[PDB]
Design an enzyme around this catalytic site. Structure first.
Site, PDB file in Angstrom:
ATOM      1  CG  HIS A  69      -5.271 -62.528 -44.112  1.00 52.80           C
ATOM      2  ND1 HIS A  69      -4.671 -62.319 -45.341  1.00 52.80           N
ATOM      3  CD2 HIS A  69      -6.268 -63.423 -44.325  1.00 52.80           C
ATOM      4  CE1 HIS A  69      -5.284 -63.050 -46.252  1.00 52.80           C
ATOM      5  NE2 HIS A  69      -6.256 -63.728 -45.663  1.00 52.80           N
ATOM      6  CD  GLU A 122      -1.974 -60.185 -43.392  1.00 53.96           C
ATOM      7  OE1 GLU A 122      -2.031 -61.256 -44.056  1.00 53.96           O
ATOM      8  OE2 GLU A 122      -2.492 -59.123 -43.794  1.00 53.96           O
ATOM      9  NE  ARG A 154      -4.329 -66.900 -45.361  1.00 56.07           N
ATOM     10  CZ  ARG A 154      -3.766 -65.977 -46.133  1.00 56.07           C
ATOM     11  NH1 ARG A 154      -2.846 -65.142 -45.638  1.00 56.07           N
ATOM     12  NH2 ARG A 154      -4.128 -65.867 -47.393  1.00 56.07           N
ATOM     13  CG  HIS A 168      -3.615 -58.311 -47.068  1.00 54.50           C
ATOM     14  ND1 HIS A 168      -4.008 -59.607 -46.807  1.00 54.50           N
ATOM     15  CD2 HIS A 168      -4.650 -57.723 -47.717  1.00 54.50           C
ATOM     16  CE1 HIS A 168      -5.227 -59.800 -47.282  1.00 54.50           C
ATOM     17  NE2 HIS A 168      -5.637 -58.672 -47.845  1.00 54.50           N
ATOM     18  CD  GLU A 190       0.391 -58.589 -48.889  1.00 56.19           C
ATOM     19  OE1 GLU A 190      -0.564 -59.226 -49.368  1.00 56.19           O
ATOM     20  OE2 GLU A 190       0.757 -58.695 -47.700  1.00 56.19           O
TER      21      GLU A 190
HETATM   22 ZN   LIG Z   1      -3.015 -61.126 -45.757  1.00 58.03          ZN
END
Ligand SMILES: [Zn+2]
Ligand SMILES: C[As](C)(=O)[O-]
Ligand SMILES: C[As](C)(=O)[O-]
Ligand SMILES: C[As](C)(=O)[O-]
Ligand SMILES: C[As](C)(=O)[O-]
Ligand code: NA
Ligand SMILES: [Zn+2]
Ligand SMILES: [Zn+2]
Ligand SMILES: [Zn+2]
Ligand SMILES: [Zn+2]
Ligand SMILES: [Zn+2]
Ligand SMILES: [Zn+2]
Ligand SMILES: [Zn+2]
Ligand SMILES: [Zn+2]
Lengths: 65, 307
Positions: B68, B71, B126, B195, B269
């Site tokens: 993405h 990020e 994104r 991410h 994340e």
């Molecule tokens: Zn992501």
């Protein structure tokens, strides 16, 4: 959801969230800000103020991650 | 200009990151190589770094960042991991032992078109940049495009959606390029897709509530990994399945990699929890990369000791 313009439009001691104009408990306002640096919501519709799409997830306006 | 003059504490352009790939290879020609796995929708090369001390089709760890595009701390951390591997191999015993049995594959800019677009046009982009028939909205969510629960609940049919799944599984060349690489390799043992943000470590599934068959082992490894991460600066990560920890997400990367028999399929994340969100200050790149590396080491060591 209950819509509001000020705290006096809410019930059960809830406050008006100014960003999205919905009523929420102080506890939920505190949680969404502390845990997620965001605002409460009842559905995706309460998260539309951002041009970059957010979603209502677990009571707060989340980004897609 | 060398990888020692490169500024790891700032955010870079695509061209700068691609320069870094070439300098790292040129400086470490017997440890590092650059593999082109495809070209993006708009024709940009897609590059994976291979770190290897030899052998043929050795068991391997895959790590991707930047699937993405917005990020940014993920691509910045991936650059730092690449330098880190070259710094520690031959110097740190434990990591040396890792790379003496396992290869590492690292895809730093997994969505180059999106990444270019985040600099040129829309910082908060994104998705991929593919065009979709029947819409003027551009791009498919590359993390809803994989052939695991494809098109089921946890993705959108609306091309304008941030979670649009695309016309069919693997429609996005950025995704298909990895699929082809993974299947051709056949011996990846861990696959980690990175991410930001929210400070989570997650394992399958995203698309359904059914526990993954290796749930308990993966949850045990997750706890060990987030504990290691926390040791450095006290950064708190929670962990669990994607569906429990974030939300239902169908056609996601690690559900597909797990379906290929890659047991140690994890998605991170990174920092933060929303204060800065995708716009994480550059002064946090290096601390983020450092703490994340500790979690990655935990996973690699577990993979090594469970052959
Ligand atoms: Zn992501
Ligand atoms: C375009 As340049 C000076 O970062 O190689
Ligand atoms: C083995 As050589 C060509 O780097 O001296
Ligand atoms: C041992 As050499 C630096 O000539 O490849
Ligand atoms: C030390 As163990 C519980 O990861 O096999
Ligand atoms: Na395509
Ligand atoms: Zn929460
Ligand atoms: Zn040096
Ligand atoms: Zn430059
Ligand atoms: Zn250059
Ligand atoms: Zn040499
Ligand atoms: Zn830029
Ligand atoms: Zn272990
Ligand atoms: Zn074990």
């Amino acid at each position: 959801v209950r819509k509001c313009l000020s705290d006096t439009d809410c019930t059960n001691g809830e406050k008006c969230v100014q960003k999205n104009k919905i009523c929420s408990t102080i506890v939920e306002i505190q949680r969404c800000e502390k845990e997620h640096f965001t605002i409460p919501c009842k559905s995706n519709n309460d998260c539309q103020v951002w041009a970059h799409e957010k979603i209502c997830n677990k009571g707060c306006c989340w980004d897609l991650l | 200009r060398s990888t020692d003059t490169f500024n790891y504490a700032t955010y870079h352009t695509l061209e700068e990151i691609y320069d870094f790939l070439d300098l790292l290879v040129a400086e470490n020609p017997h440890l590092v190589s650059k593999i082109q796995i495809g070209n993006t929708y708009e024709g940009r090369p897609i590059y994976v770094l291979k770190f290897s001390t030899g052998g043929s089709k050795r068991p391997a760890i895959w790590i991707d960042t930047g699937i993405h595009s917005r990020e940014w701390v993920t691509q910045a951390s991936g650059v730092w991991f690449a330098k880190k591997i070259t710094q520690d191999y031959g110097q740190d015993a434990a990591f040396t032992a890792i790379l003496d049995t396992l290869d590492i594959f690292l895809e730093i800019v997994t969505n180059p078109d999106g990444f270019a677009f985040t600099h040129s046009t829309n910082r908060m982009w994104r998705k991929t940049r593919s065009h979709t028939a029947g819409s003027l909205c551009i791009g498919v969510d590359p993390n809803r495009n994989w052939d695991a629960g494809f098109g089921l609940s946890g993705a959108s049919s609306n091309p304008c959606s941030e979670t649009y799944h695309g016309k069919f599984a693997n429609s996005e060349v950025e995704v298909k390029s990895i699929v082809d690489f993974v299947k051709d390799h056949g011996n990846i043992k861990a696959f980690i897709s990175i991410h930001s943000y929210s400070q989570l470590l997650m394992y399958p599934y995203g698309y359904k509530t059914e526990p993954v068959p290796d749930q308990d082992e993966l949850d045990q490894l997750s706890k060990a990994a987030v504990t290691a991460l926390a040791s450095l600066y006290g950064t708190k990560f929670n962990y669990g399945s994607i569906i429990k920890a974030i939300y239902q997400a169908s056609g996601s990367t690690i559900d597909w990699t797990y379906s290929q028999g890659i047991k140690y399929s994890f998605t991170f994340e990174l920092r933060d929890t929303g204060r800065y969100g995708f716009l994480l200050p550059a002064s946090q790149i290096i601390p983020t990369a450092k703490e994340t590396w500790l979690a990655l080491l935990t996973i690699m060591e577990h993979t090594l000791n469970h052959p």
